[PDB]
Design a protein around this ligand. Structure first.
Ligand SMILES: CC[C@@H]([C@H](C)O)n1ncn(-c2ccc(N3CCN(c4ccc(OC[C@@H]5CO[C@@](Cn6cncn6)(c6ccc(F)cc6F)C5)cc4)CC3)cc2)c1=O
Ligand code: HEM
Length: 484
């Protein structure tokens, strides 16, 4: 009566890892139907306490700074991958402000600039890459698991870092990111640093990529032109001063960029991968977006005026599509807080011993039939003339709160929380809809793809983000054959 019911573990230290590791939303539901909303289950030595539904969103995201802590849970996943000093390798208050700094490059004025850039890179890929080669080919097959992470990393790189850094990638140093990218695996949670080639190439890579950003930060500064609020590198050059007057070192700034680049790239890659495969099973939907985009362009020329950020606003169908994939495949299937003081689940007789791991999964409610009718059908129409990414789209108090990076909703009690809530809330929400929006609109305008006498592959949950199975590929044709 004082603790949540810990459950059976197939092999004990191993715990429920396979059932949960194989499918969390299924595993969660099986327990719910005979224990209720909260229950514990052990995993890799660490036992896991879960709270399902909106109320579990409140108890976790809105937990006091003293009761839980995300630094503890994420430290080894990120630090060895990004670097020291920043993001979970520092007090919470340092993290909060590092958000404030970064947000200055994620504003409406930046976004208007980012869209043409982001589109321009996509068009580079359509031509130069073997997957498409639109200039010479009219048919094609694209492995979305290859293309999307490359398109996402090139688009993010160009928007947030600039054109000098995007030209540096055209080289072998591209490799260094593949090596650091491999370092970013849930295998870190338990194995942070081992002596085999993987971990060495990963530490080496980090230090060389950190140097690359340090040198560009250096020159961009001394050269003396950091004036346009061009990007994320500019905004950290001018804002990197904490409350107390302490100032981030340039290596620390460099590690933050790496953190944010890889952080944003993985999540956004999944979602673009997923709405390509899903849009491919239902090509009817692609033509909905295509008609809407052409009607917006108006009378002649494929586009009367190349599509802008403001225009991206006027396209509910594009935005509704992004909301549906984030519902059906929230890249982050489970979010953790390590418990630092015993917690008294209210409207309950439970204490969560200190030292347990607290797991919240908005994705469950997203996939849940208890909260969405026909939850496993890809139907973006369910968003009824409501294309907003977020608002207090659910109940309880939704008044505002400031944790040090801008005022944010107090109430997190919604079934749909793809970007989370509370202090660790995502700051990249609007950058994603822009980036993904531009990828989507650029894709349908030039290509019409399909899905090979089949339907969407089963998701793999064994990595950072929820990704598709190995033979994941779309077969494209051209909506207009002659353009160069
Ligand atoms: C079946 C055999 C079995 C045995 C074991 O072999 N087995 N096999 C396989 N598995 C297996 C494999 C994996 C798991 N994982 C459980 C834990 N999951 C996970 C996912 C995401 C996480 O997020 C980390 C942070 C959160 O915020 C981010 C992200 N972000 C938000 N916006 C942008 N980025 C962030 C923030 C800000 C930044 F600036 C940067 C950032 F990055 C980073 C944390 C944890 C992964 C799956 C479980 C089981 C097994 O159990
Ligand atoms: C669809 C794409 C994205 C999704 C679904 C997403 C989702 C989330 C979620 C759920 C969290 C909360 C994690 C937690 O509570 O522990 C989060 C945090 C965060 N995200 Fe994102 N994110 C996305 C893209 C981005 C991008 C593009 C950036 C940067 C440009 C970004 C930066 C962050 C940061 C800095 C945090 C805060 C980490 C913390 O407070 O501990 N995310 N994101």
């Amino acid at each position: 009566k004082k603790t949540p019911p810990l459950v059976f573990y197939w092999i004990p230290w191993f715990g429920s890892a396979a059932s949960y590791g194989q499918q969390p939303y299924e595993f969660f539901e099986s327990c719910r139907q005979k224990y209720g909303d909260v229950f514990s289950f052990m995993l890799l030595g660490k036992i896991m306490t879960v709270y399902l539904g909106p109320k579990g969103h409140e108890f976790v995201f809105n937990a006091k700074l003293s009761d839980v802590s995300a630094e503890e849970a994420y430290k080894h996943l990120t630090t060895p991958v990004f670097g020291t000093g920043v993001i979970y390798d520092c007090p919470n208050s340092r993290l909060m402000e590092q958000k404030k700094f970064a947000k200055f490059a994620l504003t409406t004025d930046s976004f208007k600039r980012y869209v043409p850039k982001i589109r321009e890179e996509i068009l580079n890929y359509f031509v130069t890459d073997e997957s498409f080669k639109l200039k010479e080919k009219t048919h094609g097959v694209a492995n979305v698991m290859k293309t999307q992470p490359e398109i996402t990393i090139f688009t993010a790189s160009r928007s947030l870092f600039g054109d000098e850094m995007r030209r540096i990638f055209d080289r072998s140093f591209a490799q260094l990111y593949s090596d650091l990218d491999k370092g970013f695996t849930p295998i870190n949670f338990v194995f942070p640093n081992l002596p085999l080639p993987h971990y060495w190439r990963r530490d080496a890579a980090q230090k060389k990529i950190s140097a690359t950003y340090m040198k560009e930060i250096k020159l961009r500064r001394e050269r003396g032109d950091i004036d346009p609020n061009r990007d994320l590198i500019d905004s950290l050059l001018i804002h990197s001063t904490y409350k107390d007057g302490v100032k981030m070192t340039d290596q620390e700034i460099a590690n933050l960029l790496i953190g944010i680049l890889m952080g944003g790239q993985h999540t956004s890659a999944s979602t673009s991968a997923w709405f390509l495969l899903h849009l491919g099973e239902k090509p009817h939907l692609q033509d909905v977006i295509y008609q809407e985009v052409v009607e917006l362009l108006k009378e002649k020329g494929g586009d009367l005026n190349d599509l802008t950020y403001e225009d991206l606003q006027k396209l509910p169908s594009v935005n509704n599509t992004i909301k549906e994939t984030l519902r059906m495949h929230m890249p982050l299937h489970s979010i953790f807080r390590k418990v630092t003081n015993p917690l008294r689940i209210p409207e309950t007789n439970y204490i969560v011993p200190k030292g347990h791991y607290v797991l919240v999964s908005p994705g469950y409610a997203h996939t849940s039939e208890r909260y969405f009718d026909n939850p496993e059908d890809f139907d973006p129409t369910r968003w009824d003339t409501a294309a907003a990414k977020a608002n207090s789209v659910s109940f309880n108090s939704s008044d505002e709160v400031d944790y040090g990076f801008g005022k944010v909703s107090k109430g997190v009690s919604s079934p749909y929380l793809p970007f989370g809530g509370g202090r660790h809330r995502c700051i990249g929400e609007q950058f994603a809809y822009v980036q993904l929006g531009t990828i989507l609109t650029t894709f349908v305008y030039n290509l019409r793809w399909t899905i090979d006498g089949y339907k969407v592959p089963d998701p793999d949950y064994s990595s950072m983000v929820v990704l598709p199975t190995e033979p994941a590929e779309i077969i494209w044709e051209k909506r207009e054959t002659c353009m160069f």
